Amino acid sequence: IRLPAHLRLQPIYWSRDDVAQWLKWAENEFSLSPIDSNTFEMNGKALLLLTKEDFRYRSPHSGDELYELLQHILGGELQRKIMEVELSVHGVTHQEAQTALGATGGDVVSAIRNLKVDQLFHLSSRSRADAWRILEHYQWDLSAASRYVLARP
Ligand SMILES: [K+]
C-alpha cells in the first residue's frame, strides 16, 4: 500500500527507531501476528545484513515475509550490495560503491576487484597493471597489497 514517511528513505538510513516503525507498518499492512518491537534492536544497515534464516529465528511467524519485503520490494538487495562493496574496499566512499556496482551490473565481485585496483593504483606512481600484479600476487587482499607497496626498500 502506502509507506509512511522516513520509511520512504533507503533502508541504510533507517534509524533504530525507524526499524521499529517499519515493523509496526508491516504488521498493520500485512495483518501479521504481533511483532515485539524489541525483536530487531538495530538500525537499517544492520537489518540488511541479516539472512532470511535470521529473520525466521527472530520472527517465526513473519520473518520470511519481512525479509522479502525489505530485501526484494523496498530495495534492500542493492543497499546490501553497496554496503558490502564499501566495507570490502577500505577508503571507498558510499557514492563510489554505488557507481562501481552500476558499472558492473550489480556484480559485487567485479565491483570490489575494480575498486581494489583503483585504491592500490592511488598509493604510488605504479601503473594499473602493476597494481593488478600485486593484488593477484596477494590474493586480492588490498590490505597486504597496500603494505607491500608502502614497505618497499
Ligand atoms: K573504471
Q: How far, in Å, is the centroid of ligand 1 from the Cα of 82?
A: 16
Strands (E), the chain: none
DSSP 34: P
For cell 499492512, the residue is 29
**Whole-Å CA distances, 150 to 14, 56, 87:** 38, 46, 22
Q: How far, in Å, is the centroid of ligand 1 from the Cα of 31?
A: 46
Show the DSSP H helices in the chain as ranges. 16-29, 44-49, 52-58, 63-68, 76-88, 94-102, 108-121, 128-137, 142-150
Q: How far, in Å, is the centroid of ligand 1 from the Cα of 49?
A: 27
How many angstroms separate the CA atoms of 37 and 23, rounded?
7
Q: Which fold has domain 11-78?
A: DNA polymerase; domain 1 (1.10.150)
Query: Experimental technique used?
Result: X-ray
Q: How far, in Å, is the centroid of ligand 1 from the Cα of 114?
A: 7
Q: How far, in Å, is the centroid of ligand 1 from the Cα of 89?
A: 15
Q: How far, in Å, is the centroid of ligand 1 from the Cα of 106?
A: 15
For 134, the 3-state DSSP assignment is helix
Of 68, 70, 67, 107, nearest in space to 88 by CA: 107
Q: How far, in Å, is the centroid of ligand 1 from the Cα of 110?
A: 11
Q: How far, in Å, is the centroid of ligand 1 from the Cα of 29?
A: 43
